[PDB]
Design a protein around this nucleic acid. Structure first.
Lengths: 213, 82, 175, 25, 135
RNA sequence: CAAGACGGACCAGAGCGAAAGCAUUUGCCAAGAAUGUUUUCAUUAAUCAAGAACGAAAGUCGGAGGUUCGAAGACGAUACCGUCGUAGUUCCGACCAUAAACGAUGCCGACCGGCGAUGCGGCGGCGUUAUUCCCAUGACCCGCCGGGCAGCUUCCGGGAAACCAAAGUCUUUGGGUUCCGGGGGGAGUAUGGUUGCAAAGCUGAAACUUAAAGGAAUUGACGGAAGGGCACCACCAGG
């Protein structure tokens, strides 16, 4: 009987300073009427904004998860939550005559953000190859999978969340795996594809500030 | 075909065949003298050996067994017999 | 300005180059859009310019090349250009019945028939176009003709003989 | 073609039919 | 009324074009998917079960959200197609393609178009039987 | 957040296992083929009754669990369809021993055409790559051998033919060996015996009846069906 949208107000949400573009959009939240506080309803929102909306010249097939947990008077604050891949890229990348290799770790970083990682790799046909298919044998698969697990863990465990997300912008971990596995079997297109975020420590306001600058 | 001297085949056809399917069968393996780089001793080593042959005085490894022919240690010199 | 990205599979690269001269020509003389063939990412980039009008045709331009990606003929793809309300629906064969191995291979055989006669008969009667992937079936045509062709396609893969489906679909053509 | 087949099924054929029916000095 | 954004920049929302076998949902919400704005079904427009899932039903459903959104200030929408998913089909039906073409006629600038279906690693058993197909 | 299910796309001219069967990562356990061998024993071998081991799905007894699906069952529309849902579907502990359990095609051995592709192992060789890699090593390239899976082709021959590199080396008929057939019904029925909690499995006739039963390829009629054409002895608009 009454229009609800006229009662609602807006908030300006922005990404942290680690991207070239900081503003990401606008969010509509119901106003506070004493029963429920608008900040509490904004404390548990997870966003999905692609990478190309954050950087100009970078690629588009990567998606980032941003958790929203703080507002500062028309200044909404965001934090990293996870990273995925676009489904249209993933379906096109899986061809037929090549082997798909998985690897996952449960890595704990230096400031408590326990993450789960997933990686995928594809064998590469050589330029002078006459054979149709390029299948990697099972022990070569296990060797690559063991190498994939150990390189990714040693890149995150000794690091905190600052330079880890700096590695994810050009996918430097994928460039590391492709470079380091040439001795076993030539990989074609290796990428970290899914980042999860299991165990969150006690929330505090200090480390969020240098993330936002 | 249908006329070839099966008693006198060409020697290139013989080494191509399986070792049992030759006219009179003969092994593909051989014995060889190996000079250890760390000594001057001579050791007779089977080409398809399955155990790590050690030097008689140096007690160093000479060959490592593999699926087929033995993999000699790098730096060693070998000469086949006969 | 607006831009769309269209992936191309590796098996579709050969007919895309072979039928290239008849693809960009309707885009430039009649549609007024600029396209490029990005070899580095294997994508077809279609984008606007200063010479384009009729903003409805941008989505039609994306559906133009997407039909050729899935395997439709070129002349069937330009049939989407000059018509205004044509839709494409796709479904896997095992979306309706669990078929494994040899049973799945014979399901594709009943859709085609000897020399594609069963597919061509459904193609000619419902005035649609049907292409067969390894397991996917794509149908392009007007919405009421889709449901008529989908009904005939499903009854083929149930195991009703192609003689009965050939006879029945010609009687339904009288409506 | 699909569009040729639809437009042929939407319009009417016409044209060829010859019907044979029917001074100086 | 509306967001306090100048004419140069546009406000982006998302939509969930959930096109099942029976109707077509057009659900426009915020970037988080938490605050909803407009959601119309196939039963909003035509009171007939014959054209419950028709492209004409989705065309009217998509347009009426588009005239609704322009006084809320949002003239830019991201696209999320969705089929039934799970055990059932994966490619979205013609209702989603109709609604996508319908709401683009309102002149709103478009964002990113991509497919989200509930893709299983593998599902459980099919609703149809061993023998049963659609018909 | 929980509960159980099951491992897409990669997944194939593929691989393993005695068959049934076998697909997320990692650790362990004991197995196995093939290859390589100038290693050891020296005929230790092939084939089958009962017996023994295993034997999909469904089903029968005891527990655990029930997400999904769903025989029976209850409604609604018209045996086809939809909603809900018992037993069952999942695990362990015992039974049952059956499938189009298929190559509708015993096992072991000798001989007999071609090709170029694949999986594993082994050997040999110019070269490209690990940002011209500083020797080896993996990844490709070329060739050869062995054992496999699986194609295409052939006046080797064979066959009723479809077709078969075995279904060939068969009236020019004998390598060794097991099971089993004898025109169609009566009939896997009656009885007996035996195993099984049961359901049922294994073995199993006769009297009588009948001139057929059946197998392999090929079209041709075949009431008709779909397309065109012609006609005021057909119609439309009319007299």
């Amino acid at each position: 009987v009454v229009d609800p949208f006229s009662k609602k107000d807006w908030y300006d949400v922005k990404a942290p300073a680690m991207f070239n573009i900081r503003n990401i959009g606008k969010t509509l939240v119901t106003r506070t009427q004493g029963t429920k506080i608008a900040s509490d309803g904004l404390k548990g929102r997870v966003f999905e904004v692609s990478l190309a909306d954050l950087q100009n010249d970078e690629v588009a097939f990567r998606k980032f998860k941003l958790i929203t947990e703080d507002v500062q008077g028309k200044n909404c604050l965001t934090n990293f939550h996870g990273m995925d891949l676009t489904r249209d890229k993933m379906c096109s990348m899986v061809k037929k005559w090549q082997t798909m290799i998985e690897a996952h770790v449960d890595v704990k970083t230096t400031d408590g953000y326990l993450l789960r990682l997933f990686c995928v790799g594809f064998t590469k046909k050589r330029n002078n190859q006459i054979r149709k298919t390029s299948y990697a044998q099972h022990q070569q698969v296990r060797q690559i999978r063991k190498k994939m697990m150990e390189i990714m863990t040693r890149e995150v465990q000794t690091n905190d969340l600052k330079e880890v997300v700096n590695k994810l912008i050009p996918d430097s971990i994928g460039k590391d795996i492709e470079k380091a596995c040439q001795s076993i079997y030539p990989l074609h297109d290796v990428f970290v594809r899914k980042v999860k975020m299991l165990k969150k420590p006690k929330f505090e306001l200090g480390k969020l500030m240098e993330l936002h600058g | 075909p249908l006329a070839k001297d099966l008693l006198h085949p060409s020697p290139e056809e013989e080494k191509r065949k399986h070792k049992k399917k030759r006219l009179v069968q003969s092994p593909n393996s051989y014995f060889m003298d190996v000079k250890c780089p760390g000594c001057y001793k001579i050791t007779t080593v089977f080409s398809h050996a399955q155990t790590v042959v050690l030097c008689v005085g140096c007690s160093t490894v000479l060959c490592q067994p593999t699926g087929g022919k033995a993999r000699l240690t790098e730096g060693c010199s070998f000469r086949r017999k006969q | 300005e607006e831009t769309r990205k269209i992936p191309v599979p590796a098996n579709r690269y050969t007919p895309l180059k072979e039928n290239w001269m008849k693809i960009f020509t309707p885009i430039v003389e009649h549609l007024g859009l600029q396209i490029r063939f990005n070899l580095k990412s294997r994508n077809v980039e279609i984008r606007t310019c200063k010479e384009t009008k009729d903003v409805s045709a941008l989505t039609k331009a994306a559906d133009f090349v997407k039909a050729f990606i899935l395997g439709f003929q070129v002349e069937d793809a330009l049939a989407l250009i000059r018509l205004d309300d044509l839709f494409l629906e796709s479904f896997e064969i095992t979306d309706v019945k669990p078929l494994k191995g040899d049973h799945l291979s014979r399901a594709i055989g009943r859709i085609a028939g000897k020399g594609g006669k069963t597919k061509f008969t459904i193609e000619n009667v419902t005035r649609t176009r049907i292409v067969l992937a390894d397991v996917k079936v794509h149908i392009l045509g007007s919405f009421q003709n889709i449901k008529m062709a989908r009904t005939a396609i499903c009854n083929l893969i149930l195991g009703n003989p192609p003689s009965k489906v050939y006879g029945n679909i010609r009687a339904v053509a009288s409506r | 073609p699909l569009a040729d087949q639809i437009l042929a099924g939407n319009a009417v054929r016409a044209g060829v039919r010859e019907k044979r029916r029917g001074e100086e000095y | 009324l509306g967001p306090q954004v100048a004419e140069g920049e546009n406000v982006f929302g998302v939509c969930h074009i959930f096109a099942s076998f029976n109707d077509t949902f057009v659900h426009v919400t915020d970037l988080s998917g938490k605050e909803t704005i407009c959601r119309v079904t196939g039963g909003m427009k035509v009171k007939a079960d014959r054209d419950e899932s028709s492209p004409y039903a989705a065309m009217l459903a998509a347009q009426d959200v588009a005239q609704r959104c322009k006084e809320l200030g949002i003239t830019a929408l991201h696209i999320k197609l969705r089929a039934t998913g799970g055990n059932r089909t994966k490619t979205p039906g013609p209702g989603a393609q109709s609604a996508l073409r319908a709401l683009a006629r309102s002149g709103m600038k478009i964002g990113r178009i991509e497919d989200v279906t509930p893709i299983p690693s593998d599902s459980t058993r099919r609703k149809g039987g061993r023998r049963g197909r659609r018909l």
